[PDB]
Amino acid sequence: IQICRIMRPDDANVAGNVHGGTILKMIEEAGAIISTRHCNSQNGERCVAALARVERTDFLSPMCIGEVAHVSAEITYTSKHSVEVQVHVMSENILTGTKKLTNKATLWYVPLSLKNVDKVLEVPPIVYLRQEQEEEGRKRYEAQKLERMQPVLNPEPNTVSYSQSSLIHLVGPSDCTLHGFVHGGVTMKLMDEVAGIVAARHCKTNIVTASVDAINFHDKIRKGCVITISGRMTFTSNKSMEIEVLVDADPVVDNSQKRYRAASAFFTYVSLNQEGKPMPVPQLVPETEDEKKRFEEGKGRYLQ
Amino acid sequence: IQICRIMRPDDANVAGNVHGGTILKMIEEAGAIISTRHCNSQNGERCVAALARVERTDFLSPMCIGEVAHVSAEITYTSKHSVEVQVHVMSENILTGTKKLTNKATLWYVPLSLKNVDKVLEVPPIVYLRQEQEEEGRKRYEAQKLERMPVLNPEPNTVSYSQSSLIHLVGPSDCTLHGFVHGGVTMKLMDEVAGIVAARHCKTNIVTASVDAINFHDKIRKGCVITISGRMTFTSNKSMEIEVLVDADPVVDNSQKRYRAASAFFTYVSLNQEGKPMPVPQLVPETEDEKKRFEEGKGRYLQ
Amino acid sequence: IQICRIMRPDDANVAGNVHGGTILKMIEEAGAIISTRHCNSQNGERCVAALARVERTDFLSPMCIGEVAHVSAEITYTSKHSVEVQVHVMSENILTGTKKLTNKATLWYVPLSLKNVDKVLEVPPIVYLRQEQEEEGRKRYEAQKLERMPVLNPEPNTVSYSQSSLIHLVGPSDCTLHGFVHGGVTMKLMDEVAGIVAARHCKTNIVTASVDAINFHDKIRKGCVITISGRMTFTSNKSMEIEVLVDADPVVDNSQKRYRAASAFFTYVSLNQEGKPMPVPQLVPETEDEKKRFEEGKGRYLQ
Numbered sequence A: 001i002q003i004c005r006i007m008r009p010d011d012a013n014v015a016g017n018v019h020g021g022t023i024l025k026m027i028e029e030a031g032a033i034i035s036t037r038h039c040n041s042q043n044g045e046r047c048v049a050a051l052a053r054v055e056r057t058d059f060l061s062p063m064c065i066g067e068v069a070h071v072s073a074e075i076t077y078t079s080k081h082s083v084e085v086q087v088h089v090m091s092e093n094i095l096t097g098t099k100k101l102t103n104k105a106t107l108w109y110v111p112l113s114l115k116n117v118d119k120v121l122e123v124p125p126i127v128y129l130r131q132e133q134e135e136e137g138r139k140r141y142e143a144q145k146l147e148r149m150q151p152v153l154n155p156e157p158n159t160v161s162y163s164q165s166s167l168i169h170l171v172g173p174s175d176c177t178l179h180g181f182v183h184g185g186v187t188m189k190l191m192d193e194v195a196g197i198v199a200a201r202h203c204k205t206n207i208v209t210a211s212v213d214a215i216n217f218h219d220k221i222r223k224g225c226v227i228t229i230s231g232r233m234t235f236t237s238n239k240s241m242e243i244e245v246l247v248d249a250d251p252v253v254d255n256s257q258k259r260y261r262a263a264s265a266f267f268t269y270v271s272l273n274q275e276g277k278p279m280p281v282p283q284l285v286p287e288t289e290d291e292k293k294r295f296e297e298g299k300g301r302y303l304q
Numbered sequence B, C: 001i002q003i004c005r006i007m008r009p010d011d012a013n014v015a016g017n018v019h020g021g022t023i024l025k026m027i028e029e030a031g032a033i034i035s036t037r038h039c040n041s042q043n044g045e046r047c048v049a050a051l052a053r054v055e056r057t058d059f060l061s062p063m064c065i066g067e068v069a070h071v072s073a074e075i076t077y078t079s080k081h082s083v084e085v086q087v088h089v090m091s092e093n094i095l096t097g098t099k100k101l102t103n104k105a106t107l108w109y110v111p112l113s114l115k116n117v118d119k120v121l122e123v124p125p126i127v128y129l130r131q132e133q134e135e136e137g138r139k140r141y142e143a144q145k146l147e148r149m150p151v152l153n154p155e156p157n158t159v160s161y162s163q164s165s166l167i168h169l170v171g172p173s174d175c176t177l178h179g180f181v182h183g184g185v186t187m188k189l190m191d192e193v194a195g196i197v198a199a200r201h202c203k204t205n206i207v208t209a210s211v212d213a214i215n216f217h218d219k220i221r222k223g224c225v226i227t228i229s230g231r232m233t234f235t236s237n238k239s240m241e242i243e244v245l246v247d248a249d250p251v252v253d254n255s256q257k258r259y260r261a262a263s264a265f266f267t268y269v270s271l272n273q274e275g276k277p278m279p280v281p282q283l284v285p286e287t288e289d290e291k292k293r294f295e296e297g298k299g300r301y302l303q
């Protein structure tokens, strides 16, 4: 168990369910603390473990204000320079005594030198109880390694341009951060918000985050940047919607550095019935060639 | 009449000086407190005073972390349905003992029914010490009452070269006890985008000299997404004027249209190491609307 | 001697009552401001006063959103290296005009050099109006100086049934202008875990009556992870006392071991759905240390 805290009114959305960004920030905190503690076991160069990838997060059951969140983490795998961390988020009602599993996630972290930033160090190794666990971890590692290799016109209903949305945010201070960079939590909250906007615009009904499927942090964001979090619908099942979210970082004045793509993610959203079963959502129809390529790649991700 | 706090690390801008948004939020808080207490003075219908206009804010000298901010407020004038409030924000260094006058502003508030909102109620009158005070107040009131009646590939020093925008989804800690959001969140965002546009146009360090006309046209509720767009309007040889507009869109109801929630005019300058305004690059308008806005920027400059 | 602000939605819970943690941080802020101004009065070494002890905080009456808090402070007694500050928190309803005495506290601060931290400096003395004031101050100072020298499967209403803990990574708005964290957030987390254990033991709505001995043993720097652990010590027929302990371990430097940063005693009470205090279930000790802590908590209760 790496983090435990109380959900408060500011942790929720306007409706009263706790924000996806808050759950993501707790997940990141737990994974980062245990990964950082593990990569300084053998007392090497002083390092901090940075989140590089959210392999997957499942929103199994909703969390609400007043409940206590216990988020625990276990180090499954460590590569040459990366560590895989599995994290479980449970909610407990302190009066009712009930405890449910709210979220389940897998993340990837990599240690960065504190002395000379941008320098990756070698993860110390971990000892496994069963060899099948270690090879299954290696298989997942090689799978994720394999996987790694915006204009809007006048909109018609149920088109990509119709739901396409965007947030623009000036990154502020980070005083007590481990490094000079800002945590993935702020950016993930913004990504979740843009995904929710796109889903609600496309489906015109209640919506729920089913899962966040692949969050990649391409490079760090420093203070004084202004980030554009752009969200677009990529592919829809009959009962689910997929949203690509892209985070681009721009220097305000510094033309020494050019605009770059800082992060990318895929959100799977669903709308449920009063009973709690996934209801049919309107189907997205692509119009351009790139939209249809992204729809096909969404179907491929759907069946694999 | 009084509000006072200590400036802390989250209160600062990227530079490490107290954010302009934080100063504006404290000014709004002080004005709202004193006018709300005054508009329930005579024990009428229970009401709350809402900020409607920032007539002007002067950033005289910067404030820094660790200092204590003292914000004082005085009700200058009362109309039939509005209150004019003058506000001073002073900084106090608790170690050196030094105290500077950091900002000076005057605001306009309107009391709104708590029982039946959207109903504007009648401000109780204030008694003036001299008749000249009330006459100057009426003059200022009538002045403010009268005055209220897409970027392609850019070339440098144009409006399009500096034009920028922030987009924000209004969440739950932006709003008050009711669904409306404080003027503070919006003013902080306007200041941020104005600073962005000014830094893009002038390519050096800059500082807000004054905030000229913040008008709050309509309320913003939770669940809206607001676009705070900033563009440069007119430049002196040593000063720049930035227009900031707040547009609010309903996310889900496409029956409902986008509306203009707030508008303001920012004056930015770039200063020397000594502290004197240095020449800023000149804005050249390209379209007809750009120079129309440049011409009224010159008009505002000469008055 | 004074700080005042208006309470906003983030300072309160869903019901509209201000969190105890926010009141505690405001008390700390006011005390620190005046302690810092006094310990730089006569132009010694440039220093800032850090909160070391909360002698007691009484929650006399609740404060709610929209009311403005006026926090006043007075320097009661100063030792060789510490300053005693008494603080009153008053709430003002700006509509009804009513003002209540909400909370009253006594705190201890110690000046630390800004140039070389960990260096304690000598508090300048204060001149008393009556000799009895200084004599009572010396008595209280010597009293406080004297005073400073695992849950298995549980059965209901024992210590293990209620014992709880929070785990927190020091985040971005927790710290001061320097690497240390304000006492306010730490006290807020202590109040939260005390409320958690109290609600687990009492199965009702509950409220903090008073917090008695908050000691800040050592500072917490950025990059620590703190465990705020709370366990029940002794229960009256209508009151509960909860001991809260704050332990900090460094995440990155594994060279350093766990250390005890803070400790406090919270007394909680149980309310009805109407709002009347109901009798609380009696805590039963099982071990020898549990019964020692129950008896010494009773001793603290009878004082």
Ligand SMILES: CC(C)(COP(=O)(O)OP(=O)(O)OC[C@H]1O[C@@H](n2cnc3c(N)ncnc32)[C@H](O)[C@@H]1OP(=O)(O)O)[C@@H](O)C(=O)NCCC(=O)NCCS
Pocket: A050, A051, A052, A053, A079, A080, A081, A082, A108, A110, A120, A144, A148, A181, A182, A183, A184, A216, A217, A218, A219, A220, A221
């Ligand atoms: C993570 C980061 C350091 C990657 O470094 P890099 O420039 O790609 O250098 P590398 O040569 O180490 O890249 C490959 C290796 O890095 C790690 N890595 C990089 N990207 C990864 C990804 N999407 N998923 C998992 N591991 C990744 C792995 O260690 C990978 O393979 P390995 O097993 O051979 O070590 C860099 O992209 C980054 O910092 N992104 C921003 C993360 C951030 O947000 N930081 C602020 C706080 S969250």
Ligand SMILES: CC(C)(COP(=O)(O)OP(=O)(O)OC[C@H]1O[C@@H](n2cnc3c(N)ncnc32)[C@H](O)[C@@H]1OP(=O)(O)O)[C@@H](O)C(=O)NCCC(=O)NCCS
Pocket: B050, B051, B052, B053, B079, B080, B081, B082, B108, B110, B120, B144, B145, B180, B181, B182, B183, B215, B216, B217, B218, B219, B220
């Ligand atoms: C300002 C607001 C109340 C205007 O009210 P309205 O519905 O247009 O009603 P009216 O225009 O007929 O006028 C009512 C009074 O308000 C005054 N008023 C309205 N807008 C004003 C402005 N920008 N500046 C100065 N006075 C203004 C009017 O002068 C009038 O009083 P008067 O007769 O003494 O002149 C409305 O825009 C609003 O609700 N703004 C709130 C924005 C916000 O976020 N505030 C802080 C958080 S709630």
Ligand SMILES: CC(C)(COP(=O)(O)OP(=O)(O)OC[C@H]1O[C@@H](n2cnc3c(N)ncnc32)[C@H](O)[C@@H]1OP(=O)(O)O)[C@@H](O)C(=O)NCCC(=O)NCCS
Pocket: C050, C051, C052, C053, C079, C080, C081, C082, C108, C110, C120, C144, C145, C148, C180, C181, C182, C183, C215, C216, C217, C218, C219, C220
């Ligand atoms: C308070 C602190 C400076 C104590 O310093 P120290 O290393 O123990 O050195 P000493 O205690 O000998 O310093 C002497 C003074 O400190 C006072 N002091 C220390 N702890 C105290 C406490 N809990 N209550 C009251 N006084 C205390 C002593 O009474 C003494 O005063 P005196 O000499 O006039 O009698 C240290 O414990 C600390 O820093 N705690 C954390 C405070 C913090 O978190 N600051 C950041 C903002 S909250």
